Design a binder for this molecule. Structure first.
Ligand SMILES: [Fe+3]
Length: 348
């Protein structure tokens, strides 16, 4: 291998936004394109599980449909914020212009200016031109809308034809949104089959199409745009907690051993295990997983609960059951009793 592309496309159901994680497989340096504020914990957890270092978030434009996660990721894991200079956004670390390279390891994206949806849209072209991220400029068999944010259908047509359709025909095109379950298109497909501006359609054909869309008023533009013009400027605190990519809150085991009386330890193993050679954590209370749902009245509402099992799996499902029963301070012991014993930690 060596310096291969690690690639992840992630979808945000609320806004139908695609976020793209890219990284160099050797150096593990990464960029994240169009992160969504509501998905910041998810994105961060994925970056951690893949063992990546996020150098930059990159916004293709000022979004009207969601708040960018750029600000919050900068705060949380120190990624730098990049957006186009033409966007007018304040508070970025790097302002991008046509021709700029965003580097990650030996890999890079090159910026092409592709306004039309907004005046600050850009398209990010992978170094080898096998894929490009088109924002809301070119969508799968469509385009972004042109009626807000200083959009302009004449400008969009010229950007698509002049900057995107000039890429190689096999180049994949990853958009910032899709509402139909589609993930990718290609230069050759859109050149031929885009129904608004592909085939032989001219600029006036396209602008007549766009004038007669009459889309509903953008439902979030009055909140999202002022937030994104500041790059996205507007957690459980009872212990050092981390959320897995799977969505499970996990407690720090060293902290737990030093603070055993601050929490209720719920052991969801079977009785033969609870009394078995793995031992148990001092004051662990046995409630086997198959009984837990029906016995939550026995758990206190005054201290956090940490669930434990053999190796962390059953106790993860116990956190789900406890959250569904309304317990809001619950965490899993990652690695379970096996890891607890492997680290020589105290047992009854
Ligand atoms: Fe947009």
């Amino acid at each position: 291998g060596s310096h291969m592309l690690i690639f992840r496309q992630l979808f945000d159901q609320q806004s139908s936004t695609y976020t793209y994680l890219l990284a160099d497989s050797t150096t593990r340096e990464a960029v994240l394109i169009d992160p969504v504020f509501e998905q910041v914990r998810r994105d961060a957890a994925l970056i951690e599980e893949l063992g990546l270092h996020l150098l930059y978030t990159i916004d293709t434009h000022v979004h009207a449909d969601h708040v960018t996660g750029a600000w919050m990721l900068n705060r949380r894991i120190g990624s730098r914020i990049a957006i186009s200079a033409a966007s007018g956004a304040e508070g970025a670390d790097r302002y991008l212009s046509h021709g700029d390279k965003v580097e990650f390891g030996t890999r890079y994206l090159t910026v092409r200016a592709t306004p039309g949806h907004t005046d600050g849209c850009i398209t990010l072209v992978l170094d080898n031109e096998t894929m490009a991220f088109t924002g809301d400029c070119l969508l799968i068999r469509g385009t972004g809308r042109t009626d807000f944010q200083r959009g302009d259908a004449h400008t969009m047509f010229r950007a698509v034809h002049g900057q995107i359709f000039t890429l190689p025909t096999a180049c994949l095109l990853y958009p910032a949104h899709d509402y139909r379950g589609l993930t990718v298109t290609s230069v050759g497909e859109e050149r031929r089959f885009n129904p608004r501006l592909g085939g032989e359609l001219c600029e006036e054909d396209f602008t007549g199409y766009m004038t007669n869309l009459h889309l509903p008023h953008p439902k979030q533009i009055d909140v999202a745009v002022p937030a994104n013009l500041k790059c996205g400027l507007a957690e459980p605190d009872w212990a050092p907690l981390t959320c897995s990519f799977a969505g499970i809150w996990e407690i720090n085991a060293q902290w737990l051993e030093e603070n055993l009386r601050a929490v209720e330890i719920v052991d969801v193993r079977e009785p033969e295990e609870f009394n078995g050679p793995l031992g148990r954590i001092p004051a662990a209370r046995l409630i086997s997983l198959g009984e837990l749902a029906g016995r939550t009245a026995e758990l206190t509402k005054d201290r956090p609960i940490v669930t434990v099992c053999r190796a962390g799996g059953r106790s993860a499902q116990a956190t789900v059951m406890l959250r569904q029963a309304g317990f809001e301070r619950v965490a899993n012991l990652p690695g379970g009793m096996l890891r607890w014993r492997a680290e020589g930690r105290v047992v009854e």
